[PDB]
Design a protein around this nucleic acid. Structure first.
Lengths: 81, 122, 86, 84, 102, 72, 84, 71, 78
RNA sequence: AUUUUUGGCCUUCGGCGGACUUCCUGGGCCCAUGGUCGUCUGCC
């Protein structure tokens, strides 16, 4: 399938994204762009060796994002179907 | 008037002449420092032409560097002000009532304070 | 005006010795004769030898032949042609 | 090709190891794949090697492991793939 | 009568330009509302600075309050600026850059 | 868009490249991907020693800075 | 094209500054700029990360190794930013 | 031609050397793609000119593959 | 949609090098090109004014506050 | 598939070369007699 289509189908859910600079951003996604530029709502971001912070809206680039973890109760099979 | 969230939002946020973000609440006659979280992060604070009597009750603002509480009625400095603003570099309190040796000792014990303005004071 | 593609084609036709210092590594070189090329500057050199130079005086420390080695265009950085002594 | 191998692994639902260039290993069964080498997997075991430093001296390596319910790996972060 | 004033005879023998600009900005903020302060380390800018306030009346009041004020052991001579301030023109939106390529 | 290397053609230029390398030579040509080939190239490290290599080419990604040492 | 490309084209041929990915920061008279971030400048001064401030009568820069640019306030507040 | 070289080295004993750690992987490469992605079977990885061990089915992308040769 | 809604507003962007640029972002381009005015770079804090950030170095961005009040809004009628 | 979006990265710094600038030296931005400054490579 398509990764962008899968992200759009699995959007509006609480996910945690690990960015390759050692960052961890946890929150519910508000919008997912076709270029993996996901905008999240009520996000908490903690960098590597830095104190965590909370932001209402934040955008993370797909190239800068290394990995993503969605909720365990999300219907992955229904989203990929 | 009282320092409220609407007054903090209507305070003039612009760029200072020293190339820094400055929030000024002049002409509001704030009796005390309040709604610091509503004001948010500001590098310079300008509470000139106000009626602030206590120099304190500020939130955790490490980004604050410049403070100008001149032309006010501040007579004492709270001990939590240096903890709330440990990175403050410029402090101006001209034409105020701050003339205490304890206030001078607190200003000296402030670690990042480099510029001090205390003219026209007892 | 000699383009880089024309220069690479002329070097491949002449089969002259070429040493290519790799990208992000000033002490790694590949010495040989260019036999093939692509649009992404993928140079395949026959009888190639990988040379690891010393970090102090930039002298040749280790040399190891590998035969036909295909070097990536992003991997290869600085290619210089050396004229043989006839 | 690699896309056919990823599709076969996703169809077989067999555990595979993805080596990420930041020194990471991810053992997980293949569930989804993309054209840009981006994969979605379930029940992922993440392993890494850490070298603590005590009093300015390098210590012995330690293997750290963690479990994730659902994970997504990008093709840029993924360096190597091994099918088991 | 203008919102910009020129301060001359300033101490610039060994005082740092950034420190002098910060001190002038702090003094202007204590005296009133200040929009911009410019002080370079050129030959004509040695000891000469330009202070543009928020209003012409505020600038005149600040000049009257700090006329002949001693700054770092040296009095500063305050005079009316012969030209408009660039920051004031940028704030007003009618700024016209010069056509000369100097 | 091809690079504007026509003014730097047939001129002595020094190219600063990553790894602190200075390649000084007469520019012979250029491509659309900023790939410059220089004749009579001399490579110099930070120590200041210059070693001649002959005719060399620099890739577009490998080339960082270019500066003509003569009038242009 | 792009709004940043148009802004760079408008800011070309003036006193500007550039910061590169290698750490060297230059300031000077930028002359020619391209839509593919190809900048040609004359009369610039470039300072390295640890000292090493020199001059440059001619400099060619590409956006692959360039990090950021600093342009004039007139170019920032030019009429191209007006609402449609 | 790199494409003809990869076609000739398909299902052949090839060694791919990475750009980090001086690591090499030698084995029977079988599957190749247009994005320079190489899948090999019964591959063995070696580090610093010393064998590290056999892995098996190994897929290497062009982002991690630096050089390729035929054994 | 989201980029158009959050354009010309107070945003803070953290790059791959860790430097954070905060200010009124005014222009956005789909190659992750952000053109902002009165930018402040924190690594030590400095002011740069007009700045352009490319996606080759930009890592993440967030909306720190809404759009600021205009000079006419500040000096409005009485 | 080289200049944005599918990363040429993983990732310590001491004996220490070379900086950079901060304030607090002395003299007339200039020169010596400065001292500090904590982020950079670096040298063995």
């Amino acid at each position: 399938m398509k990764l962008v289509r899968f992200l759009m189908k699995c959007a509006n859910e609480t996910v945690t994204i690990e960015l390759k600079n050692g960052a961890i951003v946890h929150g519910t996604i508000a919008s997912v762009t076709p270029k993996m530029d996901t905008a999240l709502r009520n996000v908490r971001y903690t960098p590597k060796g830095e104190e965590p912070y909370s932001v209402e809206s934040l955008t993370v680039r797909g190239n800068t994002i290394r990995y993503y973890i969605l909720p365990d109760s999300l219907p992955l099979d229904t989203l990929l179907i | 008037m009282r320092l409220t969230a609407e007054l903090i939002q209507n305070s003039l946020s612009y760029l200072n002449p020293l190339k820094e973000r400055e929030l000024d609440l002049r002409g509001h006659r704030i009796p005390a420092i309040e709604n610091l979280g509503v004001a948010g992060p500001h590098d310079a604070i300008d509470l000139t032409d106000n009626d602030i009597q206590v120099l304190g009750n500020f939130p955790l603002s490490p980004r604050l560097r410049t403070l100008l509480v001149a032309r006010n009625r501040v007579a004492m400095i709270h001990p939590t002000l240096p903890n709330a603003i440990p990175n403050l570099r410029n402090l101006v309190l001209a034409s105020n009532n701050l003339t205490e040796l304890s206030d001078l000792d607190v200003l000296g014990k402030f670690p990042r304070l480099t510029h001090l303005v205390l003219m026209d004071n007892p | 005006l000699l383009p880089p593609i024309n220069f690479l084609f002329r070097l491949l036709q002449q089969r002259t010795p070429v040493q290519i210092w790799l990208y992000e590594q000033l002490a790694i070189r590949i010495t040989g004769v260019i036999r093939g090329f692509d649009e992404f500057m993928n140079l395949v050199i026959d009888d190639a030898v990988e040379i690891k130079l010393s970090p102090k005086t930039n002298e040749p420390e280790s040399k190891r032949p590998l035969g036909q080695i295909l070097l990536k265009g992003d991997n290869i950085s600085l290619i210089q042609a050396l004229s043989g002594s006839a | 090709g690699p896309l056919s191998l990823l599709q076969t692994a996703v169809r077989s639902h067999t555990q595979v190891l993805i080596s990420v260039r930041s020194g990471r290993k991810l053992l997980a069964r293949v569930k989804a794949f993309d054209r840009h080498c981006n994969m979605i997997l379930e029940n992922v075991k993440e392993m890494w090697t850490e070298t603590p430093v005590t009093n300015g001296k390098k210590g012995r390596p330690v293997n750290k492991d963690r479990f994730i319910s659902k994970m997504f790996l990008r093709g840029d972060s993924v360096v190597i793939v091994l099918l088991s | 009568p203008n919102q910009t004033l020129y301060v001359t005879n300033l101490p610039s023998a060994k005082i740092q330009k950034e420190d002098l600009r910060t001190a002038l900005y702090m003094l202007f903020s204590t005296y009133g509302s200040v929009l911009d302060v410019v002080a370079l380390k050129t030959m004509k800018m040695r000891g000469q600075a330009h202070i543009v306030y928020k209003d012409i009346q505020t600038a005149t009041m600040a000049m009257r309050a700090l006329d002949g004020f001693e700054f770092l052991g040296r009095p500063m001579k305050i005079s009316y600026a012969k030209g408009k301030s660039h920051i004031i023109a940028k704030l007003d939106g009618t700024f016209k850059p010069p056509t000369a390529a100097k | 868009a091809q690079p504007e290397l026509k003014k730097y053609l047939d001129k002595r230029l020094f190219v600063e490249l990553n790894g602190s390398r200075r390649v000084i030579g007469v520019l012979r040509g250029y491509d659309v991907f900023l790939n410059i080939v220089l004749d009579d190239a001399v490579e110099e490290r930070p120590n200041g020693e210059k070693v001649k290599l002959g005719m060399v080419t620099i890739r577009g990604n490998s080339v960082v800075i270019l500066e003509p040492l003569e009038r242009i | 094209i792009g709004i940043p490309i148009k802004l760079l084209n408008e800011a070309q041929g003036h006193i500007v500054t550039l910061e590169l990915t290698t750490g060297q920061t230059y300031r000077g008279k930028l002359i020619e700029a391209e839509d593919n971030m190809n900048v040609q400048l004359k009369d610039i001064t470039v300072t390295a990360r640890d000292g090493r401030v020199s001059h440059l009568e001619q400099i060619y820069i590409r956006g692959s190794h360039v990090r950021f640019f600093i342009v004039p306030d007139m170019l920032r507040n030019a009429p191209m930013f007006r609402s449609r | 031609n790199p494409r003809p070289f990869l076609q000739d080295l398909v299902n052949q004993d090839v060694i791919v050397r990475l750009k980090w750690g001086q690591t090499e992987y030698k084995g029977r490469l079988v599957s190749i793609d247009s994005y320079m992605n190489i899948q090999l079977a019964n591959t063995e990885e070696f580090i610093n000119y010393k064998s590290t061990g056999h892995l098996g089915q190994v897929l290497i992308r062009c982002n991690n593959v630096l050089w390729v040769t035929a054994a | 949609g989201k980029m158009a809604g959050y354009i010309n507003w107070r945003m803070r962007v953290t790059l791959n090098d860790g430097r954070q640029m905060t200010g009124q972002m005014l222009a956005f381009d789909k190659h992750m090109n952000l053109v902002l005015a009165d930018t402040e770079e924190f690594r030590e804090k400095r002011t740069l004014g007009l700045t352009i950030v490319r996606g080759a170095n930009i890592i993440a961005l967030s909306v720190e506050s809404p759009p600021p009040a205009d000079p006419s809004a500040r000096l409005g009628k009485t």
